[PDB]
Every structure is written in C-alpha cells, then in structure tokens.
C-alpha cells in the first residue's frame, strides 16, 4: 500500500500548505485598501483602429519602444504596426495559418509566433536582405503552442497544450529546460520584470510559479473554478492577475502565496481572454468574451471603466511599457488603441 | 503499476518543496502593493491621463 | 502634407502591404476549408490518401475549386481550447468506419459526432459524413448482427438496411436540422467518387451560404 | 408640352 | 547584397544612354532605389528616385525631362535612360538601395558605380573641405543646413556617408544619431536641427575618406560639399 | 367635344395617398438605413435602395400640396426642378438597385464558384457607383426641361416639361415620345427582364438544391420560391401600371381613342403613380426586413 500512503501524505502536505496560507491571512487586501478611496471613472477613447487583418486576431504584443506592435491573425499573417501612424511596418506570411500566440523580442530584432502546428517560429525582422526570414522553427512541443515570451534574442519561453512549458535556446533550437507539472493545457505565460521567474496558467484552474534557471515549480496558486486563460505579472513582479472562463480575475501574491483579491461581477458571466496591468498596477485591464474590456481598480476590485468598441470577442490585450496606451485585439479583425 | 507510485512520490517531493517556503502576512503583502501603486500613480498615463500635448496618440 | 519624405515612403509601403493583404484575402476567400474529423482507426487516413505533430493540411484542387483540408489528428489536447479556430470552415468532413459497430467504437464515433454537430462554433457548418469500410461491413454483417451496436434495431441484417439504419442513427444526432445539413456518403477501399461527393456537397454548402448571405435566407 | 398630364404630377419622361 | 551598374562609357554630347543595375542578394522589389552621381573629382549629387512598387518617382531639377528612371522587378534590375546628354553628366552613377519604414536604414547599400563620360533646395554646408588627422585622436566633422532638418515628428533627417578613396560611399549614421549596421561605434552623431557633427573617437587608417552630409527631409536630397580626412 | 375633366374625389384622395406613402416609405426606409448604418454582402444594395426610396418619397408633400390646390405650385421653378429630378433619379436608382440585387444574387447563388471573380469585379460598390451615376445622367432632361409657368387656363403656376428649351412646338411630340419610350425601356424593360432572368435561374437552383424529401428543406424551399415570385410580382404590379398607362397615352397621338378611354387614362394616371410609390414602402419588408437577422438587428437597435 505504498501508492495510497503517498497519496495520503500528499494530501497531508496540501493540508499543511493550506493551513500555512491561512495563518498568513492577517487581513484582506480590500480590508486594507478601503480608505485609499476610488480612482474614479476611467474613460478611454479609441485613438487608433489598426485595420488590415482579415480574420480573427488571436495574439498581439507591444514592442518595448511602446510604439510598434506585432499582431497575429489566423488569416496566416503577422503584421508589425506603427501605432503612432497606423502604418504597417511588416507583414509576415506564416507557414501555418493557425497562429495562437505572438511575441515581440525586447530588442525588437525578432518576432515569434506559434499555434496548432506545435512550433514556435522565430522571425528575423532585421535582415540584410530587406525581408523578414524565419530564423528558427522551434519544434518539440507535442501540443498547440499557447503563449511565447522572449527572455532575450536567444532564449524564449513557450507555453503549450501538452501541459508543459519549455525554455529554448534559439541558436541551437533545443529545449534547455522543460517545465513539467501542469495537468491541463497550459494556456498563457507571464515573464517577471527580472526575467528570472515566470508564471503559467493552465486548464486546471491552477497557476504555477516557475524558476527559469533552476527549472523547478516554486509555488502553485489555486482558487479559480475553470481554465485560466490569461496570466499577467504585477509591475513589481510580486503578484499575479489570472483571467479564467468563470468570469473572474484573481490577484495572487508570490510572497504571501495566497489569492489577495477577486475581480468578479454579477453582470459578467463570460470568460476572460486576456488580462494586463497598468504601469503602476492600480488598474487591471481584462478582455472578455462579451466583446468588452473592463478596467478594474486592482486595489479595491471596483470596475473603473469599460473599453467597449469591439464587435466580437476581445482575444488579446496589452499595455505599453511606458503605460501610455492600451491595445485590444479582437475576433472582429481589428486592433484598437485606447488612451 | 510502479509508474503511478513514482508520480505520487514525485508530487509529494514537489509539495514538500512548496510547503517549506517563507510566506509573509497578507497585510504586509497588501501594504507593499498599495505602496507600489502610490509611489507610481503619477507615472501612470492610464490612471492619470496625460495632457493632449504629451499624448502620442492625440 | 505635414509628412516628411520618409513618412510618405513608409505610408506607401503600408499601402502596398494593404494591397498584398487584399490580394491574399481575396484568393483565400475562394479556397474551400474542410475540417477533417473522425475517431481513431477510421478511414480518415485512407480518404486523405485518396484526396491528394500538430495540424496537417492537405491542399487539393478539383474542377475549378481549390480545397484545403485540416487533419487535427494527433492534436490530443483539450479541444474546447482550439475548436473555435475552425469556426468558419466551409464544412466538416467526419469519417466513420462502418466495420466498427461490433468492435463500443461506433458509439464513440456517435458521441464525438454529437459534440461536433451540436457544438456552438458549428451551428451553421454542414457535415460531410463519410461512412468508410463498407465491404468489410458487408462481410461482417452476415455473421455479427447490427443489434450488437444498437439494441433496439428492428430490420434486416442486410447491407442496404443496416447501412441506412446507421446513417439515420448518425443523422438524427443533428439537433440543428434547420441550420445545417449532413451529407452522408458510403466510401470504400477504392471508391474514386469521394472527391466528387465532396465537390457536390461543398457546392451545395456554398450556394446555401450565398443564399443566407444575399439575404434570401 | 402639348398633352395635359405633362404637369399635374411627376413621373415625366426621360 | 550586390548592385552592379552597367552602361557607362564615352558618349557623344547630346546623345542618349541607359544605365542598368543588376541587383543581387536582397528583396529588390521592397526597396526604393536611387541614382546618385559624382562628377570626376567633386561631391555626391542625387539624380533620381523610384519607390518600391515604382509608384513614386522624383528627379533633380538638372535631369528633369532628360533622365528616366525605371524599375524591372522580375529581373531585379534598375534603369536610367539618359537623353540629351551634356558634358555636365560626366559622372559616376551609383545605384543606392533605400527602404523606408519605422526605424529603417535608407541609403544603407550603394552600388559600385558605372563611369559615364560625355565629351529653394536645402543647402547642406560642410564648411570644412579637408582635415589632416592623426590615427587615435578624436575628429569632429561638422555640417550645417539652410533649413532645420528637425521634423515635426521628432526625426532629424541627416545622413552621414563615408567614401574611402577607391570605393563607393558607405552609410555611417542615419537620421543624425543612429549608427548603421557594420560600422563601429567610434562614429557618433549629434546635432541641433541646423548644425550637425560627426565624431570619430579613435581613428584608424581606414577611416580616411570623404565624409558627406546628406539630408532626407525634402526632395531633392542634397549632399554636403564633402569633408576629406587625410593623414 | 372631349375636353378632359378630372374626378372630384381625386383632388382630395391623391394628396391623401401621397401623405400615406410619405409617412410609410420615410419611416420604413429610415428604419432600414438606421439599422444598416447604426448597427455582409447585399448590404450596400439594401442601403442604396433604401436611400433611393427615401429620397423618392420624401419630396411628395410638395406634390400633395400642389394637387390639393388644384394644380397650383407655390414652391418655385427650382423646387419643381429639384423635386422632379429627385423623383426621376430615384425611380431609376431604385429599379437599378433591384436589378443589381438580382444580378448579384445570380452571381452568388446560381454558379457561385465560376462567378467568384466576376462578382468582386462588377458587383458591390462598383455596381452602386455605376447605377447611381447612370440614374443621375438619365434624369437630366427632367432637370433641364421641368419648369414652372402659368398656362393661361388656370391663372396659377404648374410644374410642366418645356420641350421648347430643346424643340419647337412643331417638334415637341417626337421629343416627349422618344423620352417616354426611352424612360420606359431603361427603367422597366431591360431591368425587369434582368430581374426575371436572374430570379428564374436562382429559382432553378433553389428548386434543385433544397430537396423536398425532408420537411425543413421543403419549408425553406417554399419560403425562398415564394419570396422570389413575390419580389417579381410586386415589382411588376407596382411599376407596370404606370408604364402601361404612360405608353398608352403616348400612343394616344397615333391611334386616337374616343377620348373617353383617354379621359380614363388621364384620370387613372395619378393612381398608377401612387401605386409606383407603394413599391418604395414595400421594399424594406421584401429585401431588408425579410432577413430575420436584419429584423432582430432593427428591433434591438431600437428596443
């Protein structure tokens, strides 16, 4: 009876973790920030509408210069946008149209995209030939590629539907480390501001804290009821934001190892496709299936505003590194830039 | 049927790793988040909108 | 005006990119996209053999019409998370082995067919249902009764009646008989008219979509 | 116009 | 990446000749191509331009109505049908590769040049004509303009080119501060809109050449006189 | 001895019909435009048709005030010209939008794979541009000739066509006959023949592809065949009376009638025009509000 004894001591360890979490629950976040007062109405207007995609926009990522975006639609093309001018800088034909994710390297020289082909393809935006080539096709995931995030020009973390996250050496195309431990399809990634830890959200209502260098899972964060579709780090890299199908965003803390605030509403029953924080972290922006993007007061869990204006599900959502604008992509084939 | 026993003991080792981290109070955690949001509230162009002269999307 | 020379050249680049995007989208709105489904050990691989780790696309042209089939086999992940990627395919080719009624395999096929047919992303997507392995089905139906798969089956243990009973059992899983149609075919090891049946069913789908789209409904 | 329904309403000729 | 120019040689005055340009090693359809000539021992002089897609074409006032620039992308070749050739057209015609998007590096590659021998613009001023320099020391090549190249969009369309004694000009710095690809970080760019400076921190024997100062704010694109660095 | 009189109840019910079609057409076409703008293919033709109908009917209170006051025109030469030109250009543009819908439905339904480039080439914004420019250029004689002048018989103003700006009193008959036959052809014979032919082929395909074996296919079969024959028959019964009585009156110069058939034509003409205006009120409920998704878009962008 070794297996059942292992099972019961695992349940005992989970009991100890739950007890040590509860013993740290000195006071609720909303039990503390109820005297700061409300941020106020957050009214953003659509400054830009990036037109040109002819199918559902599945992914979007800003450039670290806070001006250039990469956008992935399942019309089989990536498009780099000059958001200040709505100009298309590039248009990258994809070898597999079923793109679900896209990343912009922090240097700006590379753009990744993956999807149902199970490959993360790296594209060289800055070539001597004046086109955009495919520098690498990182194969090795046995499921669809959910999310990809560049650490630098040579490392990239990829999420996949084979329940595993991987870190890649682009120059050799090899998985330097694999992150195993999720029991459902891993759906999204969020790199910490230090690129030393990152967090995954899988279709098991769980979010895990991974170490990139040691390749181990440090903390598991539960509390959701359905698949977590979006993860985002707090600007100081000490907290989460997890969007799931059950129409709730949740704020977890790494150091307290517990959920701090839930962002739910009775008038919201549709899942969350994407979350993102503001530059200070006071606002949490969440894209929804109801075609809307609600802005949440992250300290009080009050709806601060609504980014209505997409005629289909808001599938992707990102705030610039300088906090200046928000970009929402959607299945109606448009990106819109708010301010 | 030893592979399931190996998975059980591996998840036990993972939980032993997770149960021995240092957790601060949720009050201290909330205070840290509130302080980061206060010390950066004016750096935020979405919580504090920027004049139309400095808005690159004007 | 007010644009610098390099600004204007960037705008011209953006406009040429727009033109290429329009060209590509126009030629893509002319190809027929067929999601190819079915349970394991069916005749899916054989028909895709006769038609031309992740998704497998097989391109194919037949009589002034370019097709694109997407084989989502080996994509053994949560389908709830990517089945909406195929919302908008012209049709769903669903492969079923008739020789799998006694081996339940056919009930697994019917359960997978029920979820895909009633799925919320595929309310107006027709379903070209291929019933494969009919010669094996005939050489099996003499000895192994069809009632092994369907208990309440009352009828002859003959090909023309057992096959029709199976066709009806699959077609009555359609809870959207107003919105989509199921086009059933009986293929075999060497049936060379499968591409023609697909072409006919797809022309019907295209005509009825243009009817619903020109407003006639 | 010589006839008597050129006026008395629209619907004229080309 | 190569541009090989063909079609030079001794021409009668008033004749007509066509310069070809066989491109190689890059997406020739995606670049705007220029023609830049250089009188026997004088400075650079922009001649024509044809955009990517052949949609936009510009000429210098000297060659308007006489020179015709063409683009034949399927053969990756650029043309310049010259007519009514005067002795002022005796020069060295370079094809220049130029691509324009946000953050690009136009004029990054120059051809090798074909020698043709006939028997309200922005004035860029390089008040210095030559500088005797010493390897290892700092050298500042200054430029000036009759109009402020600082645009309303924040870009200062100033370009620095280096032409080593027996070669074709090479882009050093684009938009007044941005170091081109393949050029070492010794070269630095700064300016104020009407006054510009090219700084070379420590000199090597290969930095010896003529440093040209082009503007890209308005057409015609105008070069400086050319500041020579000699040992 | 056949001085053509009028009917006494006409002078009171013709402005009534004009105001009825005014309210109905304006409200219906305003709703169609409101949904199609403030909410697929055939939407551009629906919008162009609704604009044609709304501008067709929206100037009718002028003619109702003109007929209420026994053919007196207190609006001026310019309002005569503008109202007449609008009426004419919108008759043309509405029949051309119906014909463009018929041809686009032919390109989409009958042979949809072979005619895939052609409909992106000669249908949509191209077709609406062509048909609107054509309607504007074919209605210019109404802009040039329609004038206001007191024919001494009433001591009042009338909006009548001149034919002196273009011809002599000895040559006006050829002018109005040619203009009438040209308007009849270009506005009812070739567009209605194209409607008939395109809808015949669409009905061939709808009868061939919707099988009568299962009941849902049969319901949709009867629905589509019935709406096709209703479109055709409505266009006919709304425009053929007008063109028929018009060509009969024009032929009246040739085989002259006993003047009582001609009195009949002159008295019944206003009702033929009033029936033509009923097409503009019915067009929403046949082309736009026949698509149940359009109807729900409407009743949800109001309610």
Q: What is the 3-state secondary structure (H, E, C) of F81-106?
A: HHHHHHHHHHHHHHHHHHHHHHHHHH
Task: Tell how many helices (H) and how many strands (E) occur in chain B.
Answer: 2, 0
Whether domain E130-229 has CATH 3.40.50.12500: no
| Nearest-CB residue to E27 (from A68, A82, A130) | A130
Task: Give A61: exposed, middle or buried? Use CB within 10 Å, 0-12, 13-18, 19+.
Answer: buried
With CA atoms as reference, report the closest residue to F56 among F27, F24, F83: F83
How many C-alpha atoms does A8 have within 13 Å on its Cβ side? 4
**Token pair recorded at residue E149:** 């190249």
DSSP F238: H
> Which single residue is written with the structure tokens 């329940």?
A163
What is the 3-state secondary structure of E90-159? CEEEEEEEECCCCCCCCCCEECCCEEEEECCCCCEECCCCEEECCCCCCEEEEEEECCCCECCCCCECEE
A291 and A336 Cβ atoms separated by less than 8 Å: no
**Token pair recorded at residue F42:** 């055939």
Backbone angles phi, psi at C11, to 5 degrees: -65, -40
Strand ordering across the sheet containing A68-73:
A57-62, A68-73, A77-82, A87-93
Angle between helix F77-105 and helix F125-138 axes, rounded to 10 deg: 140
Fold classification of E2-118 (topology level): Immunoglobulin-like (2.60.40)
All residues of chain A having their beta carbon less than 8 Å from the beta carbon of residue E103 are 68, 89, 108
Nearest CA in chain C to E150: C4
In angstroms, the CA C32 to CA A253 distance is 49
With CA atoms as reference, report the closest residue to A127 among C57, E99, E198: E99
How many C-alpha atoms does C98 have within 13 Å on its Cβ side? 30
With CA atoms as reference, report the closest residue to D5 among F246, F150, F19: F246
How would you classify the pairing of strands A283-288 and A272-277? antiparallel
CATH number of B5-57: 4.10.260.10
Are B37 and A281 within 8 A, CB to CB?
Answer: yes
In angstroms, the CA A83 to CA A166 distance is 31
B46 and A278 Cβ atoms separated by less than 8 Å: yes
**Token pair recorded at residue E5:** 């120019």
Provide the 3-class DSSP secondary structure of residue F58: coil
How would you classify the pairing of strands E9-11 and E114-118? parallel
In angstroms, the CA F257 to CA A241 distance is 89
Q: Which helix (H) or strand (E) holds B11?
A: helix B2-18
In angstroms, the CA C137 to CA C163 distance is 9
Nearest CA in chain E to A127: E26
| Nearest-CB residue to E1 (from A89, A108, A128) | A128
Q: Which residues of E182-202 are buried (b: 16+ CB within 10 A; e: fewer)?
A: eeeebbbbebeeeebebebee
Are F158 and D7 within 8 A, CB to CB?
Answer: yes
DSSP A269: -
**Token pair recorded at residue A62:** 């800003």
Are C177 and F120 within 8 A, CB to CB?
Answer: no
E120 and E140 Cβ atoms separated by less than 8 Å: no
How many C-beta neighbours within 10 Å does residue F296 have?
11
Radius of gyration for chain B, computed over Cα atoms and rounded to the nearest angstrom = 23
Provide the 3-class DSSP secondary structure of residue A318: strand
With CA atoms as reference, report the closest residue to C214 among A123, F112, A115: F112
- Distances, alpha carbon A310 to alpha carbons A83, A161, A328, in Å: 18, 28, 8
**Token pair recorded at residue E187:** 């070269």
How many C-beta neighbours within 10 Å does residue C97 have?
25
Chain A 175-204, residues with CB within 8 Å of chain B CB atoms: 181
Q: From the options 3.40.50.300, 3.40.50.2300, 1.20.1440.130, 3.40.50.1820, give the CATH code of C31-206.
A: 3.40.50.300
With CA atoms as reference, report the closest residue to F14 among D9, C7, E44, A224: D9
> Which single residue is written with the structure tokens 């700092």?
E138
Nearest CA in chain A to B11: A10
A78 and A69 Cβ atoms separated by less than 8 Å: no
How many C-beta neighbours within 10 Å does residue F181 have?
17
Q: At CB < 8 A and 24+ separation, what contacts does A25-29 make?
A: A25/A258, A25/B26, A26/B25, A26/B26, A26/B27, A26/B28, A27/B25, A27/B26, A27/B27, A27/B30, A28/A260, A28/A261, A28/B26, A28/B30, A29/A251, A29/A260, A29/A261, A29/A299, A29/B26, A29/B29, A29/B30, A29/B33
In angstroms, the CA F180 to CA D5 distance is 13
In angstroms, the CA F97 to CA E62 distance is 54
Are A161 and C13 within 8 A, CB to CB?
Answer: no
Nearest CA in chain F to C29: F116
Angle between helix F260-282 and helix F10-37 axes, rounded to 10 deg: 20
- Distances, alpha carbon F71 to alpha carbons E5, E174, F13, F18, F103, in Å: 82, 78, 14, 14, 41
In angstroms, the CA E31 to CA E130 distance is 34
In angstroms, the CA E195 to CA E192 distance is 6
All residues of chain A having their beta carbon less than 8 Å from the beta carbon of residue E25 are 128-129
E35 and E19 Cβ atoms separated by less than 8 Å: yes
| Nearest-CB residue to F41 (from C178, C206, C214) | C214
Q: Given this chain, do its domains E2-118 and E130-229 carry the same CATH topology?
A: yes
E224 and E43 Cβ atoms separated by less than 8 Å: yes
Given resolution (angstroms): 3.0
Task: Give C173: exposed, middle or buried? Use CB within 10 Å, 0-12, 13-18, 19+.
Answer: middle
- Distances, alpha carbon A23 to alpha carbons A20, A26, A27, A88, A195, in Å: 5, 7, 10, 53, 30
All residues of chain E having their beta carbon less than 8 Å from the beta carbon of residue A131 are 26-27, 30
Strand ordering across the sheet containing C182-186:
C56-61, C66-71, C32-38, C91-97, C126-132, C182-186
E32 lies within 8 A of chain C by CB:
yes
With CA atoms as reference, report the closest residue to E32 among E75, E61, E69: E69
A113 and A57 Cβ atoms separated by less than 8 Å: no
Residue F1, domain member (yes or no) = no
E217 lies within 8 A of chain C by CB:
yes
| Nearest-CB residue to A131 (from E30, E97, E102) | E30
Provide the 3-class DSSP secondary structure of residue C171: helix
Range list of H helices, chain F: 10-37, 43-57, 60-68, 77-105, 117-121, 125-138, 140-145, 172-184, 190-209, 215-251, 260-282, 292-302
Are E216 and C6 within 8 A, CB to CB?
Answer: yes
Nearest CA in chain C to E174: C6
Provide the 3-class DSSP secondary structure of residue F71: coil
| Nearest-CB residue to C17 (from A88, A118, A144) | A88
Strand ordering across the sheet containing E195-200:
E124-125, E139-145, E195-200, E187-191
With CA atoms as reference, report the closest residue to F73 among F59, F57, F86: F59
Nearest CA in chain D to F168: D1
Are E102 and C4 within 8 A, CB to CB?
Answer: no
Task: Give F106: exposed, middle or buried? Use CB within 10 Å, 0-12, 13-18, 19+.
Answer: buried
Are E106 and C6 within 8 A, CB to CB?
Answer: yes
Cα distance from D3 to chain F (closest Cα, Å)?
Answer: 9
Task: Give F271: exposed, middle or buried? Use CB within 10 Å, 0-12, 13-18, 19+.
Answer: middle
- Distances, alpha carbon F185 to alpha carbons D3, F95, F253, in Å: 21, 12, 19
Are F172 and D10 within 8 A, CB to CB?
Answer: no
| Nearest-CB residue to D9 (from F63, F180, F182) | F63
All residues of chain F having their beta carbon less than 8 Å from the beta carbon of residue C210 are 105, 108-109, 112
Q: Which helix (H) or strand (E) holds C134?
A: helix C134-141
Cα distance from B51 to chain A (closest Cα, Å)?
Answer: 11
All residues of chain C having their beta carbon less than 8 Å from the beta carbon of residue A118 are 53-54
F10 and F60 Cβ atoms separated by less than 8 Å: no
Are C54 and A75 within 8 A, CB to CB?
Answer: no
Q: Which helix (H) or strand (E) holds C182?
A: strand C182-186
E128 and E229 Cβ atoms separated by less than 8 Å: no
| Nearest-CB residue to A89 (from E97, E102, E181) | E102
E168 and E147 Cβ atoms separated by less than 8 Å: no
DSSP E226: -
In angstroms, the CA E136 to CA E107 distance is 28
Nearest CA in chain A to E109: A128
In angstroms, the CA E181 to CA E170 distance is 10
**Token pair recorded at residue F26:** 């304006």
In angstroms, the CA E211 to CA B21 distance is 63
In angstroms, the CA C1 to CA A271 distance is 45
Are A32 and B17 within 8 A, CB to CB?
Answer: no
End-to-end CA separation in angstroms for chain C: 48
Cα distance from C18 to chain A (closest Cα, Å)?
Answer: 7
Q: Which residues of A3-28 are buried (b: 16+ CB within 10 A; e: fewer)?
A: eeebbeebeebbeebeebeeebbeee
A126 and A154 Cβ atoms separated by less than 8 Å: no
Give the best residue of C2, C17, C35, C79 to mutate against chain A (max A CB count within 10 A): C17
In angstroms, the CA C34 to CA C44 distance is 13
| Number of inter-chain CB pairs under 8 A, A vs B | 165
Residue F2, domain member (yes or no) = no
- List residues bridging with A252 in a β-sheet: A259
Domain ranges within chain B, ordered by starting residue:
5-57
Q: At CB < 8 A and 24+ separation, what contacts does F128-133 make?
A: F128/F44, F128/F45, F128/F48, F128/F97, F128/F100, F131/F48, F131/F93, F131/F96, F131/F97, F131/F99, F131/F100, F132/F48, F132/F93, F132/F96
Are D10 and F161 within 8 A, CB to CB?
Answer: no
Q: Do chains B and A touch (3 or more CB pairs under 8 A)?
A: yes
Q: Report the length, in residues, of chain C.
A: 217
Chain A 300-329, residues with CB within 8 Å of chain B CB atoms: 319, 322-326
Residue F176, domain member (yes or no) = yes
**Token pair recorded at residue C128:** 């070209």
How many C-beta neighbours within 10 Å does residue C163 have?
19
Q: Do chains F and D touch (3 or more CB pairs under 8 A)?
A: yes
DSSP A43: -
Are A129 and E27 within 8 A, CB to CB?
Answer: yes
Provide the 3-class DSSP secondary structure of residue C116: helix
C13 lies within 8 A of chain A by CB:
yes
Provide the 3-class DSSP secondary structure of residue E14: coil
Approach to solving: cryo-EM
Cα distance from A146 to chain E (closest Cα, Å)?
Answer: 29
In angstroms, the CA E182 to CA E171 distance is 10
Q: Which residues of F216-253 are buried (b: 16+ CB within 10 A; e: fewer)?
A: ebeebbeebbebbeebbebbeebbebbbebbeebbebe
Cα distance from D12 to chain F (closest Cα, Å)?
Answer: 7
A274 and A284 Cβ atoms separated by less than 8 Å: no
Are A282 and B41 within 8 A, CB to CB?
Answer: yes
How many C-beta neighbours within 10 Å does residue E177 have?
14
CATH of the domain at F110: 1.20.1070.10
CATH top-level class for A1-339? mainly beta
In angstroms, the CA C8 to CA A206 distance is 49
With CA atoms as reference, report the closest residue to A182 among A217, A143, A150: A217
**Token pair recorded at residue A245:** 């199908």
How many C-beta neighbours within 10 Å does residue E161 have?
26
With CA atoms as reference, report the closest residue to F106 among F228, F201, F231, F240: F201
- Distances, alpha carbon C12 to alpha carbons A25, C17, E58, E109, E155, in Å: 59, 9, 14, 21, 18
Cα distance from C24 to chain F (closest Cα, Å)?
Answer: 13
Backbone angles phi, psi at E121, to 5 degrees: -75, 160
Nearest CA in chain A to E181: A128
All residues of chain C having their beta carbon less than 8 Å from the beta carbon of residue F120 are 26
B30 lies within 8 A of chain A by CB:
yes
Neighbours of chain C (3+ CB pairs under 8 A): A, E, F
End-to-end CA separation in angstroms for chain A: 61
Provide the 3-class DSSP secondary structure of residue A299: coil
With CA atoms as reference, report the closest residue to E162 among E203, E134, E119: E203
In angstroms, the CA E40 to CA E113 distance is 12
Cis check for the bond before E43: say yes or no (omega within 30 of 0). Answer: no
All residues of chain C having their beta carbon less than 8 Å from the beta carbon of residue F113 are 64-65, 203, 206
Are F273 and D4 within 8 A, CB to CB?
Answer: no
In angstroms, the CA A145 to CA A99 distance is 8
| Cα C146 from chain centroid (whole Å) | 26
Cα distance from D9 to chain F (closest Cα, Å)?
Answer: 7
How many C-beta neighbours within 10 Å does residue E118 have?
18
Backbone angles phi, psi at F252, to 5 degrees: -50, -20
F292 lies within 8 A of chain C by CB:
yes
Radius of gyration for chain C, computed over Cα atoms and rounded to the nearest angstrom = 21
């Amino acid at each position: 009876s070794e297996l059942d004894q292992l099972r019961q001591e695992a349940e005992q360890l989970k009991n100890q973790i739950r007890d040590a979490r509860k013993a740290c629950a000195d006071a609720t976040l909303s039990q503390i920030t109820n005297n700061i007062d409300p941020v106020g109405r957050i009214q953003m207007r659509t400054r830009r509408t990036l037109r040109g995609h002819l199918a559902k926009i599945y992914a979007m990522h800003w450039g670290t210069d806070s001006r250039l975006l990469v956008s992935a639609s399942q019309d089989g093309k990536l498009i780099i946008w000059d958001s200040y001018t709505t100009n298309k800088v590039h248009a990258i034909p994809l070898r597999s149209s079923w793109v679900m994710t896209c990343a912009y390297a922090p240097s700006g020289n590379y753009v990744a995209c993956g999807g149902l082909d199970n490959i993360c393809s790296i594209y060289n935006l800055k070539t001597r030939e004046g086109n955009v080539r495919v520098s690498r096709e990182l194969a090795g995931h046995t499921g669809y590629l959910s999310c990809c995030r560049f650490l630098d020009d040579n490392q990239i973390v990829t999420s996949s539907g084979d329940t595993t996250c991987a870190l890649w050496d682009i120059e050799t195309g090899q998985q330097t480390t694999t992150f195993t431990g999720h029991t459902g399809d891993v759906m999204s990634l969020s790199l910490a501001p230090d690129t030393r830890l990152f967090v995954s959200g899988a279709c098991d209502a769980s979010a895990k804290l991974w170490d990139v260098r040691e390749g181990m899972c440090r903390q598991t964060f539960t509390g959701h009821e359905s698949d977590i579709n979006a993860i985002c780090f707090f600007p100081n890299g000490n907290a989460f934001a997890t969007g799931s199908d059950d129409a709730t965003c949740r704020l977890f803390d790494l150091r307290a190892d517990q959920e701090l605030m839930t962002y739910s509403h009775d008038n919201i029953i549709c899942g969350i496709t994407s979350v993102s924080f503001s530059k200070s972290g006071r606002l949490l922006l969440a894209g929804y299936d109801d075609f809307n993007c609600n802005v949440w007061d992250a300290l009080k869990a009050d709806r601060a505003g609504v980014l209505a204006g997409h005629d289909n599900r808001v599938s992707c959502l990102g705030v610039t590194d300088d906090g200046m604008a928000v970009a929402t992509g959607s299945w109606d084939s448009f990106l819109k830039i708010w301010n | 049927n030893t592979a399931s026993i190996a998975q059980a003991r591996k998840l036990v080792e993972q939980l032993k790793m997770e149960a021995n981290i240092d957790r601060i109070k949720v009050s201290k955690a909330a205070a840290d988040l509130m302080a980061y949001c206060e010390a950066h509230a004016k750096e935020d162009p979405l919580l504090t909108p920027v004049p139309a002269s400095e808005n690159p999307f004007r | 005006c007010t644009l610098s020379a390099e600004d204007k050249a960037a705008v011209e680049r953006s406009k040429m990119i727009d033109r290429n995007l329009r060209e590509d989208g126009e030629k893509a709105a002319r190809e027929v996209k067929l999601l190819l489904l079915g349970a394991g050990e069916s005749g899916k691989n054989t028909i895709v053999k006769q038609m031309k780790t992740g998704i497998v696309e097989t391109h194919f042209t037949f009589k002034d019409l370019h097709f694109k089939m997407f084989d989502v086999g080996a994509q053994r992940s949560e389908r709830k998370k990517w089945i909406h990627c195929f919302e908008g395919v012209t049709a769903i080719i669903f492969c079923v082995a008739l020789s799998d009624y006694d081996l339940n395999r056919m009930h697994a096929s019917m359960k997978l067919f029920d979820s895909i047919c009633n799925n919320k992303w595929f309310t107006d997507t027709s379903i070209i249902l291929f019933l494969n392995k009919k010669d094996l089905f005939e050489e099996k139906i003499k000895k192994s009764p069809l009632t092994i798969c369907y208990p309440e089956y009352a009828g002859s243990n003959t090909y023309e009646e057992a096959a029709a009973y199976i066709q009806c059992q699959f077609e009555d899983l359609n809870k959207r008989k107003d919105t989509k149609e199921i086009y059933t075919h009986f293929t075999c090891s060497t049936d060379t008219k499968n591409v023609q049946f697909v072409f006919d069913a797809v022309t019907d789908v295209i005509i009825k979509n243009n009817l619903k789209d020109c407003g006639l409904f | 116009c010589r006839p008597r329904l050129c006026h008395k309403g629209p619907x004229g000729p080309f | 990446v190569q541009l090989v120019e063909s079609g030079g040689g001794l021409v009668q005055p008033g004749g007509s000749r066509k310069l070809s340009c066989s491109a190689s090693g890059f997406a020739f359809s995606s670049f705007g191509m220029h023609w830049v000539r250089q009188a026997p021992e004088k400075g650079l002089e922009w001649v024509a331009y044809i955009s990517s897609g052949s949609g936009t074409i510009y000429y210098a006032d000297t060659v308007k109505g006489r020179f015709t620039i063409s683009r034949d992308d399927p053969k990756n070749t650029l043309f310049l049908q010259m007519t009514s050739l005067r002795s002022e057209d005796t020069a060295m015609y370079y094809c220049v590769r130029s691509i324009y998007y946000y953050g690009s590096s136009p004029f990054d590659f120059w051809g090798q040049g074909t020698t043709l021998t006939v028997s309200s613009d922005i004035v860029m001023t390089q008040a210095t004509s030559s500088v005797p320099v010493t390897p290892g020391e700092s050298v500042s090549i200054s430029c000036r303009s009759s109009k402020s190249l600082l645009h309303s969009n924040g870009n200062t369309y100033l370009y620095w080119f280096l032409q080593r004694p027996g070669q074709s000009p090479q882009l050093l710095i684009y938009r007044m501060s941005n170091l081109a690809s393949g050029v070492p970080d010794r070269f630095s760019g700064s300016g104020s809109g009407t006054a510009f400076t090219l700084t070379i921190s420590r000199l090597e024997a290969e930095d010896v050449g003529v440093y040209y100062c082009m503007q890209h704010l308005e057409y015609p694109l105008t070069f400086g006189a050319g500041t020579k660095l000699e040992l | 001895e056949c001085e053509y009189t009028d009917w006494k109840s006409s002078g009171a019910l013709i402005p009534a019909i004009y105001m009825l079609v005014f309210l109905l057409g304006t409200t219906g076409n305003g709703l169609v435009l409101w949904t199609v703008f403030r909410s697929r293919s055939a939407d551009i033709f629906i919008a162009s048709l609704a604009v044609a109908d709304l501008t067709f009917v929206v100037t009718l209170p002028l003619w109702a005030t003109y007929t209420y006051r026994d053919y007196d025109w207190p609006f001026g030469t310019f309002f005569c010209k503008l109202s007449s030109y609008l009426i004419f250009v919108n008759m043309y543009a509405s029949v051309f939008c119906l014909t463009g819908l018929s041809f686009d439905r032919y390109l989409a339904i009958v042979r949809p794979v072979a005619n895939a480039r052609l409909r992106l080439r000669v249908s949509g914004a191209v077709a609406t541009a062509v048909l609107w420019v054509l309607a504007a250029l074919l209605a210019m004689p109404v802009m040039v000739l329609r004038t206001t002048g007191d024919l001494e018989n009433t001591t009042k103003v009338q909006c009548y066509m001149d034919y002196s700006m273009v011809a002599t009193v000895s040559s006006e008959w050829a002018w109005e006959v040619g203009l009438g036959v040209s308007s009849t052809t270009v506005g009812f014979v070739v567009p209605f023949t194209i409607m008939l032919t395109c809808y015949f082929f669409i009905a061939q395909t709808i009868a061939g592809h919707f099988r009568k074996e299962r009941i849902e296919g049969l319901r949709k079969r009867r629905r589509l065949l019935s709406i096709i024959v209703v479109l055709v028959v409505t266009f006919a019964l709304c425009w053929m009376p007008y063109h028929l009585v018009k060509t009969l009156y024009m032929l009246g110069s040739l085989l002259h009638w006993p003047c009582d058939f001609d009195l009949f034509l002159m008295n019944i003409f206003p009702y033929c025009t009033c029936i033509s205006y009923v097409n503009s009120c019915l067009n929403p409920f046949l082309y736009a509000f026949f698509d149940p998704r359009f109807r729900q878009a409407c009743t949800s962008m109001l309610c």
